[PDB]
Amino acid sequence: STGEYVVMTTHFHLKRKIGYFVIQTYLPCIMTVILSQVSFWLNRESVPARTVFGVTTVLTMTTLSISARNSLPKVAYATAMDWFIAVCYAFVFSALIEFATVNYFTKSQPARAAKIDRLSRIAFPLLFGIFNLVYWATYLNR
Amino acid sequence: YGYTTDDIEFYWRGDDNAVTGVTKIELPQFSIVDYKLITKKVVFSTGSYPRLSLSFKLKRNIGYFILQTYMPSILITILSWVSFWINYDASAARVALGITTVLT
Amino acid sequence: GDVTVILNNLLEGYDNKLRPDIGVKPTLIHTDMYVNSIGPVNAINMEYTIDIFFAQTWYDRRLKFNSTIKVLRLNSNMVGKIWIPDTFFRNSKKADAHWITTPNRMLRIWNDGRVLYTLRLTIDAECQLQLHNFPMDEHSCPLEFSSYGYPREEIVYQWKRSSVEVGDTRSWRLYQFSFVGLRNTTEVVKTTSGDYVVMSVYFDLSRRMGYFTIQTYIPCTLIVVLSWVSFWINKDAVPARTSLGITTVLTMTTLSTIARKSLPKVSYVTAMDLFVSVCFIFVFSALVEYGTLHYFVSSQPARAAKMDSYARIFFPTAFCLFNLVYWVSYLYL
Ligand SMILES: *[C@@H]1O[C@H](CO)[C@@H](O[C@@H]2O[C@H](CO)[C@@H](O[C@@H]3O[C@H](CO[C@H]4O[C@H](CO[C@H]5O[C@H](CO)[C@@H](O)[C@H](O)[C@@H]5O[C@H]5O[C@H](CO)[C@@H](O)[C@H](O)[C@@H]5O)[C@@H](O)[C@H](O[C@H]5O[C@H](CO)[C@@H](O)[C@H](O)[C@@H]5O)[C@@H]4O)[C@@H](O)[C@H](O[C@H]4O[C@H](CO)[C@@H](O)[C@H](O)[C@@H]4O[C@H]4O[C@H](CO)[C@@H](O)[C@H](O)[C@@H]4O[C@H]4O[C@H](CO)[C@@H](O)[C@H](O)[C@@H]4O)[C@@H]3O)[C@H](O)[C@H]2NC(C)=O)[C@H](O)[C@H]1NC(C)=O
Ligand SMILES: CCCCCCCCCCCCCCCCCCCC(=O)O[C@H](COC(=O)CCCCCCCCCCCCCC)COP(=O)(O)OCCN
Ligand SMILES: *[C@@H]1O[C@H](CO)[C@@H](O[C@@H]2O[C@H](CO)[C@@H](O)[C@H](O)[C@H]2NC(C)=O)[C@H](O)[C@H]1NC(C)=O
């Protein structure tokens, strides 16, 4: 509004180091997902063990999401780490839901329960591996 | 500071309208009950100095505390009481309940 | 050359303690702004940071020269030698000008005495946010300024047609909110000293949902469905269901504590703590429901057998209903 001014600009290009976020979010998330999928190799007679597995893994994922969101500014969109934590939460919740379904079919159709349990002993780890590959590939290429 | 009571004299102008804008003060946690205006003299080793005092009386609100830390205590104690309806044969459930409530 | 002579003749017999037209008429000051960035609106302190380019222009018949040059363009070396109005911002907690590398000021004295004085400011203005409808709340909170010692009879401010002009609105630090508009206003206030002309600029901020949507809402609804998962586990396994209930309650209270720790201590009930309270009630009701189920198994088994399947339908329906009601109501309010 006052005149035309000469402006000199200087951009310093940066690049964040992912080591600390790996160590403090991605390792605990992956370890929690593994600890959750461990609940499939336990026998169907031990109900309290699998219930503890499921509940404690869901709580761990919740507190991990909370501690992971504290580091960032209070931003109003979803980051990549947010998508990773959401997918890990979905995996642990699906493990708990599968255990609940198995227990619901136990003592009534134990063949179907054993079938879906032996299938979930292979379906979850491969799906998690595929998701990890896709996520890391599409986010490290940029 | 520098001038004793034989060099300066403090007084409120109006003695009740000297301080204004108190009723408009909104505090997120307290509430101004009232305020007093006092005029006196202090005595130090160097002389007697004039003094005024504007003394507010803040009263603390209770709603936030009820909703934040009294209700959870009562609900945790009730969650402890539920263990009385459970039969004495289940030793892993009543222990669970009680221990968890203690921790909480 | 000759500009030195002009500057010396303007400051010969000049008293910078007397406003122009000290005993004739009030001094009309035209004020403009340029909002660089509206900083973070932190609700805990009820304040918000803003960075502006405050421009004040008035007429001074004493800085009136007659030469070929039309305008004198000067830095901050001659600001402390002429009269400068004492404009202060009445709702600023802490504000300060810029001094690197040289005081950020500008002084342009035209031929007929018209003076333009521009400076750079960073004001931490104050506005008491009514934290109801949180986080679905909208605020419109001001930036007020006026003269300090000169009442309405001496200094009168007046906006220009194109006074306030925001910048790009994209590189601002408005994270949780969103700029929607502004408006200027002029009024007259009464003080123990006199009547003052108080100008105001109201900025309209709308809280965009997001951070809270993913920080508290989703976690709490996911805890609610976690508590519902217990309704399908067989009723004979007591420890599993008791652990479910009690750990779910613990996580619920932790999340409520965090959510309330987000915003400051307010003694009223917001719309977020209401949500976490309803979720808490849901979890507690699922646990006492299982408790009564286990107690009635010893008394009458068919009662509990029907109660389980009754709850399996009654809980998710009541939660869908609650959600619908809540959301619709607040979005219309
Ligand atoms: C309790 O005690 C407190 C501590 O003692 C006290 O605080 C002090 O208050 C005084 C007065 O209010 C302050 O002194 C004034 O400061 C003004 C600006 O202050 C800002 O900058 C200082 C740092 O000052 C350096 O930087 C400026 C800008 O570059 C220079 O102009 C200064 O000279 C000085 O430069 C030296 O130091 C630099 C390193 O920093 C060196 O690089 C440099 O080479 C120099 O060596 C900050 O500290 C201030 O921060 C504080 O204040 C802010 C206020 O909002 C607070 O928010 C914050 O928290 C801090 O508390 C602030 O950022 C100066 O402009 C001012 O000097 C001008 O005014 C006086 C009086 O009118 C003139 O006599 C003087 O000559 C200056 O005028 C000339 O320059 C102006 C430029 O605008 C011209 O317009 C003017 O016309 C005039 O030019 C003419 O003369 C020139 C020669 O003088 C000549 O060159 C020209 O050509 C022309 O002829 C004054 O110094 C002091 O800084 C405060 N100190 C602190 C620590 O806060 C407090 O008030 C006390 N409380 C009570 C109730 O009493
Ligand atoms: C590339 C991967 C990326 C995917 C992203 C997320 C994926 C989550 C993790 C994987 C989900 C399931 C893994 C594969 C399925 C298991 C294979 C055997 C299970 C099976 O037979 O299907 C039924 C479902 O069981 C179950 O497995 C029940 C659980 C499955 C879903 C439960 C829903 C959980 C919701 C998660 C989100 C919540 C929070 C998210 C923020 C079992 O019983 P059936 O009788 O139907 O079988 C019919 C045959 N007899
Ligand atoms: C800023 O203030 C100016 C001056 O008060 C406003 O300009 C007036 O706008 C109204 C309607 O737009 C017109 O009827 C008047 O004639 C204008 N006055 C002058 C002197 O131009 C302007 O609207 C204000 N900006 C806002 C409210 O955003």
From Swiss-Prot, chain A:
All ranges on the Cytoplasmic side of the membrane: 43-47
Part of the intact protein present: 233 to 445 of 456
Further remarks about this protein from its record: Functions as a receptor for diazepines and various anesthetics, such as pentobarbital; these are bound at a separate allosteric effector binding site.
Impact upon substituting T101A: Reduced potentiation and activation by the agonist alphaxalone
Stretches in topological domain Extracellular: 70-79
Source species, domain of life: Eukaryota
Domain observations: The extracellular domain contributes to synaptic contact formation.
Binding site for 3alpha-hydroxy-5alpha-pregnan-11,20-dione: W41
Protein name, entry field: Gamma-aminobutyric acid receptor subunit alpha-1
Subunit structure: Heteropentamer, formed by a combination of alpha (GABRA1-6), beta (GABRB1-3), gamma (GABRG1-3), delta (GABRD), epsilon (GABRE), rho (GABRR1-3), pi (GABRP) and theta (GABRQ) subunits, each subunit exhibiting distinct physiological and pharmacological properties. Interacts with UBQLN1. Interacts with TRAK1. Interacts with KIF21B. Identified in a complex of 720 kDa composed of LHFPL4, NLGN2, GABRA1, GABRB2, GABRG2 and GABRB3. Interacts with LHFPL4. Interacts with NLGN2. Interacts with SHISA7; interaction leads regulation of GABAAR trafficking, channel deactivation kinetics and pharmacology.
Spans traversing the lipid bilayer: 22-42, 48-69, 80-101, 119-138
Species for this entry: Homo sapiens (Human)
Reported function: Alpha subunit of the heteropentameric ligand-gated chloride channel gated by Gamma-aminobutyric acid (GABA), a major inhibitory neurotransmitter in the brain. GABA-gated chloride channels, also named GABA(A) receptors (GABAAR), consist of five subunits arranged around a central pore and contain GABA active binding site(s) located at the alpha and beta subunit interface(s). When activated by GABA, GABAARs selectively allow the flow of chloride anions across the cell membrane down their electrochemical gradient. Alpha-1/GABRA1-containing GABAARs are largely synaptic.
Record annotation: effect of changing Q37L: Reduced potentiation and activation by the agonist alphaxalone
Curated annotation (Swiss-Prot), chain B:
Cytoplasmic membrane side: 83-92
Origin superkingdom: Eukaryota
Chain residues that bind histamine: T46
Tissue expression from the record: Isoform 1 and isoform 2 show reduced expression in schizophrenic brain. Isoform 3 shows increased expression in schizophrenic and bipolar disorder brains while isoform 4 shows reduced expression.
Entry comment, domain topic: The extracellular domain contributes to synaptic contact formation.
Disease implication from the record: Epileptic encephalopathy, infantile or early childhood, 2: A form of epileptic encephalopathy, a heterogeneous group of severe childhood onset epilepsies characterized by refractory seizures, neurodevelopmental impairment, and poor prognosis. Development is normal prior to seizure onset, after which cognitive and motor delays become apparent. IECEE2 is an autosomal dominant condition with variable age at seizure onset, ranging from early infancy to 6 years.
Subunit structure as annotated in this protein's UniProt entry: Heteropentamer, formed by a combination of alpha (GABRA1-6), beta (GABRB1-3), gamma (GABRG1-3), delta (GABRD), epsilon (GABRE), rho (GABRR1-3), pi (GABRP) and theta (GABRQ) chains, each subunit exhibiting distinct physiological and pharmacological properties. Interacts with UBQLN1. May interact with KIF21B. Identified in a complex of 720 kDa composed of LHFPL4, NLGN2, GABRA1, GABRB2, GABRG2 and GABRB3.
Function: Beta subunit of the heteropentameric ligand-gated chloride channel gated by gamma-aminobutyric acid (GABA), a major inhibitory neurotransmitter in the brain. GABA-gated chloride channels, also named GABA(A) receptors (GABAAR), consist of five subunits arranged around a central pore and contain GABA active binding site(s) located at the alpha and beta subunit interface(s). When activated by GABA, GABAARs selectively allow the flow of chloride anions across the cell membrane down their electrochemical gradient.
UniProtKB/Swiss-Prot annotation, chain C:
Subunit structure and binding partners: Heteropentamer, formed by a combination of alpha (GABRA1-6), beta (GABRB1-3), gamma (GABRG1-3), delta (GABRD), epsilon (GABRE), rho (GABRR1-3), pi (GABRP) and theta (GABRQ) chains, each subunit exhibiting distinct physiological and pharmacological properties. Interacts with GABARAP. Interacts with KIF21B. Identified in a complex of 720 kDa composed of LHFPL4, NLGN2, GABRA1, GABRB2, GABRG2 and GABRB3. Interacts with LHFPL4. Interacts with SHISA7; interaction leads to the regulation of GABA(A) receptor trafficking, channel deactivation kinetics and pharmacology.
Glycosylation (residues): N66, N184
Annotated compartments: Postsynaptic cell membrane; Cell membrane; Cell projection, Dendrite; Cytoplasmic vesicle membrane
Name of the protein in its database record: Gamma-aminobutyric acid receptor subunit gamma-2
InterPro entries assigned: GABAA/Glycine_rcpt, GABBAg2_rcpt, GABRG-1/4, Neur_chan_lig-bd, Neur_chan_lig-bd_sf, Neur_channel, Neuro-gated_channel_TM_sf, Neuro_actylchol_rec
Phenotype upon changing R260Q: In GEFSP3 and DEE74; does not affect protein abundance; decreases cell surface expression; decreases current amplitude in response to GABA; increases zinc sensitivity; accelerates deactivation
Domain remark text: The extracellular domain contributes to synaptic contact formation.
Organism name: Homo sapiens (Human)
